[PDB]
């Protein structure tokens, strides 16, 4: 599924990501934009044979098959990705775990990603 910006912003809010571990909602929308272009089916293989899955491009090297205790297919649906991301952002480097978030979103006016919805 390709989410619309506002569609995804609403869904992430309903799944409890607003200020989760201190990260405002637009952070999460922004991270999805630059990770998957809002495509829940996005799959990209890493150099090392692992693959990044789903709307937030969660990496099978660590998180699924498995630190989120989930098959990676669970991350490719029109909840699992949110629950795993919540574990990831509690894990060690916060949202810096998503390099694209760090380079494109961190410390910007991320409220823009939810304005007009």
């Amino acid at each position, epitope marked *: 599924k390709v989410f619309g910006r506002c569609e995804l912003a609403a869904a992430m809010k309903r799944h409890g990501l607003d*200020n989760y571990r201190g*990260y405002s909602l*637009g952070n999460w929308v922004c991270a999805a934009k630059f990770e998957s272009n809002f495509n829940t089916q996005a799959t990209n293989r890493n150099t090392d044979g692992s693959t990044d899955y789903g709307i937030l491009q969660i990496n099978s090297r660590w998180w699924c098959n498995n630190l989120c205790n989930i098959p990676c297919s669970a991350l490719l649906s029109s909840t699992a990705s949110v629950n795993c991301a919540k574990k990831i952002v509690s894990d060690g480097n916060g949202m810096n775990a998503w390099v694209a978030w760090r380079n494109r979103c961190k410390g910007t006016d991320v409220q823009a990603w939810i304005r007009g919805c």
Partner: T-cell receptor
Amino acid sequence: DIQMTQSPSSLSASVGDRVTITCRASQDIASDLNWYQQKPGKAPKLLIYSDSYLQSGVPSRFSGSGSGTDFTLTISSLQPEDFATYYCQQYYMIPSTFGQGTKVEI
Amino acid sequence: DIQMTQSPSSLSASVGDRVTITCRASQDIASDLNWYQQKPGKAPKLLIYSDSYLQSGVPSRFSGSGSGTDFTLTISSLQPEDFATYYCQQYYMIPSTFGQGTKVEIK
């Protein structure tokens, strides 16, 4: 840079009183505000961050409210150990910026 | 929370001296370090962000360097306006956290 406007500059109150400090931001900063307590000669110590999340060891008497451009730090039942300068600092955008502080005497 | 360890705690120096302050982080914080300057009775004033980027109006005598876990603020040719308390602060993770400060006082 984001400009933070903190009031008042100073206040004096009695033990057990409610005290209220305000912090206005020049633009929407969601809830990305730190509240610090600084005692003489020491670094600022974090009390509250984000959407009123209290640091470990901080009494429930401290609470933060607000979002967007309008934030409040309320100290319920002021106690003698609360003597300090309090500061707000936004970390929504780079660079982080401070309000001017509120000196609290008890 | 990330622990920031700042050294020295205090120092005394003369106009024209070089001052060197170190900040270490308990984990890798990439380049996300602020350096603040605080004068008596005033709020901390940001001098440097991203470990080495200078605020407009701050002279190039202030040099931020380092990365990862190891950072340095070097103040060259110390001037009268430079006597103050300096603090490093990481903003890599939430919450931000402060080093304990360095008081830079006149000889």
